[PDB]
Paper text:
The humanisation series could have ended with HumRadA22, which displays a fully humanised BRC4 binding surface. Nevertheless, we extended the humanisation process further into the oligomerisation groove and “behind” the Ala pocket, in anticipation of the inhibitor design process expanding beyond the core of the FxxA binding site. Overall, the structures of the humanised [name] proteins are very similar to each other, and significant differences can only be seen in loops that are involved in either crystal packing, or are mobile and poorly defined.
Author numbering: 109 to 283, 289 to 295, 307 to 328, 336 to 349
Write the structure that this text describes.
């Protein structure tokens, strides 16, 4: 549907109101193996497709903080969906965020890059930040550092929301459930492991999906 990227699952798209939205931040929470990273890799392929096939004829940028990006997985999803894998890999730009300060600087650097590429036929339409809070949690420790950590995270989310609106891109971020917090910034989706190997998504009703050779499916 209009301005949305399909997840690869019709059930998950229905729950999301058609898929992930441009000009917005979608935040997916869950433990390791819940489907969050698999969903990010599938969306990096889906965004490239025409709108009738659930994409935006776009490119993706994947920012990693905990070594989760797998080009071979994109290659596999592309091959299994009948798409050209070299084209798919050429359209997903990868950058590692080394620490929380660098992670925050990457938003302005991505903004500078998208600006110069304004005339391009295939613009970036999806920005993924996998494990959004990992560097903030490991660099701000002790009870006294919590307020500062939250303040820096809020500023980072505000910079991402501004990026989504200046370039009409979908921002997709992954995180883990927090004992304290907190959004204001988003659309929050919790992912769980289901029976057998299915995964369940819930908005913070519910939708069932699976992890296959094609990435995310029903
Ligand atoms: Ca996963």
């Amino acid at each position: 549907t209009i301005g949305r990227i399909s997840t690869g699952s019709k059930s998950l798209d229905k729950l999301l109101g058609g898929g992930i939205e441009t000009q917005a931040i979608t935040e997916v929470f869950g433990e390791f193996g819940s489907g969050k990273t698999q969903l990010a890799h599938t969306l990096a392929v889906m965004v490239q497709l025409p709108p009738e096939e659930g994409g935006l004829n776009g490119k993706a940028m994947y920012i990693d903080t905990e070594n989760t990006f797998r080009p071979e997985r994109l290659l596999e999803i592309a091959q299994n969906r009948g798409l050209d894998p070299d084209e798919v890999l050429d359209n997903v730009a990868y950058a590692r965020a080394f620490n929380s300060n660098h992670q925050m600087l990457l938003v302005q650097q991505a903004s500078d890059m998208m600006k110069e590429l304004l005339n391009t036929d295939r613009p970036v339409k999806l920005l993924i930040v996998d494990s959004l809070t990992s560097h903030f949690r490991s660099e701000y420790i002790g009870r006294g550092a919590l307020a500062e950590r939250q303040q820096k995270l809020a500023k980072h989310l505000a910079d991402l929301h501004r990026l989504a609106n200046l370039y009409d891109i979908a921002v997709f971020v992954t995180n883990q459930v927090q004992a304290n917090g907190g959004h204001s910034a988003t659309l929050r989706v919790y992912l769980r492991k289901g029976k057998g190997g299915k995964r369940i998504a819930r908005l913070i009703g519910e939708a069932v999906f699976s992890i296959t050779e094609k990435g995310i499916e029903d």
